[PDB]
Design a protein around this ligand. Sequence first.
Ligand SMILES: Nc1ncnc2c1ncn2[C@@H]1O[C@H](COP(=O)(O)OP(=O)(O)OC[C@H]2O[C@H](O)[C@H](O)[C@@H]2O)[C@@H](O)[C@H]1O
Ligand SMILES: O=[N+]([O-])c1ccc(O)c(O)c1
Ligand SMILES: [Zn+2]
Length: 282
Amino acid sequence: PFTADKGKCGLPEIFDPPEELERKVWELARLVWQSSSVVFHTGAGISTASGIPDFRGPHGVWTMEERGLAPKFDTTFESARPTQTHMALVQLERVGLLRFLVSQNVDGLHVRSGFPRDKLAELHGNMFVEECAKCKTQYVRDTVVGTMGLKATGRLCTVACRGELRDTILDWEDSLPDRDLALADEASRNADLSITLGTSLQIRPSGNLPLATKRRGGRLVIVNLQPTKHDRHADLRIHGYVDEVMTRLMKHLGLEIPAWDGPRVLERALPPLPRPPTPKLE
Ligand SMILES: Nc1ncnc2c1ncn2[C@@H]1O[C@H](COP(=O)(O)OP(=O)(O)OC[C@H]2O[C@H](O)[C@H](O)[C@@H]2O)[C@@H](O)[C@H]1O
Ligand SMILES: O=[N+]([O-])c1ccc(O)c(O)c1
Ligand SMILES: [Zn+2]
């Protein structure tokens, strides 16, 4: 806990200049069109524009802690709106340009975004989701589950059970949930395109999954303001705000970023919605 390694925190940000940024997103555009199976890996950087601080960035939880300062939240978890990036990932799934989404975030926004849970691994859990110890039934709640570290919440299961309900937030010692990690690994290995959004890729095995894609000739794209463990293995690193990259990307793809109607829960994914026809690439 106190001892736990929080890896490299407070590294400098890189800012690709507009010309290099605009061009790198057109190449990302091309790789989404080329790819049969596109998987997105997300981390706390896709939630920073909502007012949720990240961990290892300039004003990250771990970064401000090293310098004896406090992270600053500009919102509560309950009153946080999903980002343009969160809503872009929703459209990309709906139009069939996103096979699987893998997140290290516990902020709960993916789910609150309306994103299909059966196409999502929440690898470090969800602040809003408690799980029945007895029958493994999950409850997506409307306020944050008040505990952390797979502890009893105080509520009991309501299946036609009275099983102990506990949080889904992994403690430093706790192993990842096998179902989520297994689907996340299959998705990552099977993928021909893995795009990482606002993660430093410093945690095992979360951070290593985008590298499973690169095996069998898959392409790896890293969108992050800072360096990242596996920058060396990327075919494309984009250094900029992900909201900018994903707003420009969606515009190249001919896609609108949909409205957020407030917190909604989508258990299962629907058949793909119509999407624009693919440009001639080669
Ligand atoms: N607007 C932005 N656009 C793009 N990148 C951004 C933005 N804001 C921040 N970033 C980048 O976003 C990156 C986020 O890196 P880290 O803070 O390590 O997030 P993680 O999701 O990998 O944390 C992993 C786990 O570790 C914890 O213990 C928990 O268990 C976490 O689940 C940085 O490089 C920022 O520069
Ligand atoms: O307080 N928390 O639990 C936090 C702190 C920072 C985060 O980026 C986060 O997703 C949750
Ligand atoms: Zn139960």
